Amino acid sequence: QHCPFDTLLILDFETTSDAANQDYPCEVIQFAIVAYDVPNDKIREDISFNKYVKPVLNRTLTKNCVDFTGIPQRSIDTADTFDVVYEQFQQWLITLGLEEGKFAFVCDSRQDLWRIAQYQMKLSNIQMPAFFRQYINLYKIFTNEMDRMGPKELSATTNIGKMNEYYDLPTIGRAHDAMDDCLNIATILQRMINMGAKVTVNELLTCCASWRRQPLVYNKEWRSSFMDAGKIFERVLPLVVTTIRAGDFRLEMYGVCRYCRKGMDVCGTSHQQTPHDLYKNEEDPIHFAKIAGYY
Amino acid sequence: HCPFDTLLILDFETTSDAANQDYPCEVIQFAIVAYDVPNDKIREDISFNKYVKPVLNRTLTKNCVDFTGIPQRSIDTADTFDVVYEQFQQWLITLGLEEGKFAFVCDSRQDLWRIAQYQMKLSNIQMPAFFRQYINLYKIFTNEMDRMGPKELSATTNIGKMNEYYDLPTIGRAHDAMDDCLNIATILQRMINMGAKVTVNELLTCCASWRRQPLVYNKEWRSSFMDAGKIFERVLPLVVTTIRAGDFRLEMYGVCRYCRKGMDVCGTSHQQTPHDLYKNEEDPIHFAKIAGYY
Numbered sequence: 001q002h003c004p005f006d007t008l009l010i011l012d013f014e015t016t017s018d019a020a021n022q023d024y025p026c027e028v029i030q031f032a033i034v035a036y037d038v039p040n041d042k043i044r045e046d047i048s049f050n051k052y053v054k055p056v057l058n059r060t061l062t063k064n065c066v067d068f069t070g071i072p073q074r075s076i077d078t079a080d081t082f083d084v085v086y087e088q089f090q091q092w093l094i095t096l097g098l099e100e101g102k103f104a105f106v107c108d109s110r111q112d113l114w115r116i117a118q119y120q121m122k123l124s125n126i127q128m129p130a131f132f133r134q135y136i137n138l139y140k141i142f143t144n145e146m147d148r149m150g151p152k153e154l155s156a157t158t159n160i161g162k163m164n165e166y167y168d169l170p171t172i173g174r175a176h177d178a179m180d181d182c183l184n185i186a187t188i189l190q191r192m193i194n195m196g197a198k199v200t201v202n203e204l205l206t207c208c209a210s211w212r213r214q215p216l217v218y219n220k221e222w223r224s225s226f227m228d229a230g231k232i233f234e235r236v237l238p239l240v241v242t243t244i245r246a247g248d249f250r251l252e253m254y255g256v257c258r259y260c261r262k263g264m265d266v267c268g269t270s271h272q273q274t275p276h277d278l279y280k281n282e283e284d285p286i287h288f289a290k291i292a293g294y295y
Numbered sequence: 296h297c298p299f300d301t302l303l304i305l306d307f308e309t310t311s312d313a314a315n316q317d318y319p320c321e322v323i324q325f326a327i328v329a330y331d332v333p334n335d336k337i338r339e340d341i342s343f344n345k346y347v348k349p350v351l352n353r354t355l356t357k358n359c360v361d362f363t364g365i366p367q368r369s370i371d372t373a374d375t376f377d378v379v380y381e382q383f384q385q386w387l388i389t390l391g392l393e394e395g396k397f398a399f400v401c402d403s404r405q406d407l408w409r410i411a412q413y414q415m416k417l418s419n420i421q422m423p424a425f426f427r428q429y430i431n432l433y434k435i436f437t438n439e440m441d442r443m444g445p446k447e448l449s450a451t452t453n454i455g456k457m458n459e460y461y462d463l464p465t466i467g468r469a470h471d472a473m474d475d476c477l478n479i480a481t482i483l484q485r486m487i488n489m490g491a492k493v494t495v496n497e498l499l500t501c502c503a504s505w506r507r508q509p510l511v512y513n514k515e516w517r518s519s520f521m522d523a524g525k526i527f528e529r530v531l532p533l534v535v536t537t538i539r540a541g542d543f544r545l546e547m548y549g550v551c552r553y554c555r556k557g558m559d560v561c562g563t564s565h566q567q568t569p570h571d572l573y574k575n576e577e578d579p580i581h582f583a584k585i586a587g588y589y
């Protein structure tokens with residue numbers, strides 16, 4: 001209706017982690033997708049992709065990772081590595097008969113594609129695909145919808161939690177894993193357009209930004225702060241999140257980098273703004289950058 | 296007295312995740328300090344101390360970093376265990392240390408029966424003879440208690456209890472593996488001076504009658520170091536055998552107490568694989584699987 005895509009794929013990654021440490025080489029350990037039929041307004045739970053992934057840098061899930069993701073060790077020990085699962089994911093898109101640029105991924109934040117996908121792609125030496133360099137940040141739309149329908153003071157602490165509390169949606173909790181997030185985001189997505197929300201690609205991944213031209217003011221305790229760690233991630237990772245305002249997105253933007261205006265098969269090969277300033281102190285090295293081979 | 300002229304105080308530190316005992320512990324620091332027995336002198340100038348790069352879990356958990364005091368950057372630029380182990384062997388040869396004429400001293404069975412065994416499995420290196428006999432200093436300390444006299448101890452660790460007993464200040468230089476070595480060395484010296492019979496009291500053996508029956512499985516073993524120990528005992532090929540003070544003799548070096556074979560033949564393969572523990576795909580033993588015990 002108010003969406004230029006006939007199909008929306010609610011995407012969700014879960015990764016390895018150690019809550020107390022942000023200097024961590026997060027590897028994908030679960031890959032979950034559920035399809036949403038936009039014209040017919042139907043969450044297609046029968047149309048889904050849901051695979052575990054075996055990590056290779058940290059092969060034993062920490063206890064806090066298991067508690068957070070709900071993923072047992074046995075499930076990843078018997079899983080394929082990301083390169084195999086990603087290949088199965090690409091075939092899945094073909095099997096569904098999806099065309100390039102006529103569908104878009106939906107996430108509850110930038111984290112899934114800007115950070116998790118981008119970093120995992122580096123580990124696996126896979127080129128960042130064009131359909132991961134444009135997507136729908138649902139929480140960003142939720143922000144706009146909130147000013148429009150009047151704000152509330154929400155008690156929830158997470159993006160999905162806040163959105164469910166705002167629309168008074170019961171928290172979906174069956175599998176207690178990635179697929180549950182997918183289902184919650186999908187239901188939120190559905191309720192949002194039914195409340196009259198306008199859902200479209202609102203974030204793009206580009207190769208360059210002017211705000212990265214000056215060195216980051218280094219915070220020594222960044223490893224204990226998800227917020228400050230984000231600033232580090234922004235400089236290390238080659239592609240940056242670029243907001244695109246409502247009404248400005250065209251389908252023909254797929255798959256051309258908004259900045260350099262070149263195909264995403266050429267753009268994204270090399271880091272255009274390597275943060276050398278962060279890579280010169282060997283008494284305080286960035287572990288996740290070092291092990292991924294950024295320096 | 297002690298039949299060895301040189302005692303080497305050994306300490307291993309590993310990757311870990313405290314809340315989970317089903318963890319494939321890898322050596323990340325390798326520390327040794329020498330003790331000259333005839334001269335009763337701790338030789339800090341004679342030491343081996345190197346970091347080791349793990350490969351199964353390359354990022355130290357925060358709780359491992361806090362316990363071991365090892366920073367991530369120190370293992371990132373370190374060599375793998377097989378390399379460090381080769382450096383260690385060359386270091387022994389350079390000291391002119393003749394095999395069978397020195398012995399390793401540890402504060403417990405953990406360093407050699409558990410940590411060394413498992414690491415050797417991962418590295419695919421045969422367990423050496425000088426790691427299959429050693430001195431468990433805590434077991435000597437415990438065995439000598441009635442002679443030394445009773446004393447209430449509030450410490451919870453072996454090193455802590457032994458320091459507290461002898462009113463020794465806790466050595467805390469670098470807060471790492473080497474501090475354990477220095478503490479154990481200092482305790483060892485004190486114990487010897489107080490008349491303790493310091494000699495080999497634990498031997499690693501290929502078979503044990505108490506592994507003939509399958510272990511009764513405790514489903515919650517992963518959250519308990521004690522319960523997990525029972526699992527380790529079955530999974531690891533070599534068993535701790537205890538020998539009382541004054542029964543050990545130097546000629547025992549390099550020969551298994553059970554099969555009587557040389558430790559070049561014995562230790563090639565697990566002789567009592569606990570297949571009973573490996574039947575449930577709904578509850579696999581992760582550290583056993585990833586190591587290739589099944």
Ligand SMILES: [Mg+2]
Binds near residue numbers: 012013181
């Ligand atoms: Mg999520």
Ligand SMILES: [Mg+2]
Binds near residue numbers: 306
């Ligand atoms: Mg120790």
Ligand SMILES: [Zn+2]
Binds near residue numbers: 206207260268
């Ligand atoms: Zn570009």
Ligand SMILES: [Zn+2]
Binds near residue numbers: 500551552553554555
């Ligand atoms: Zn034997």
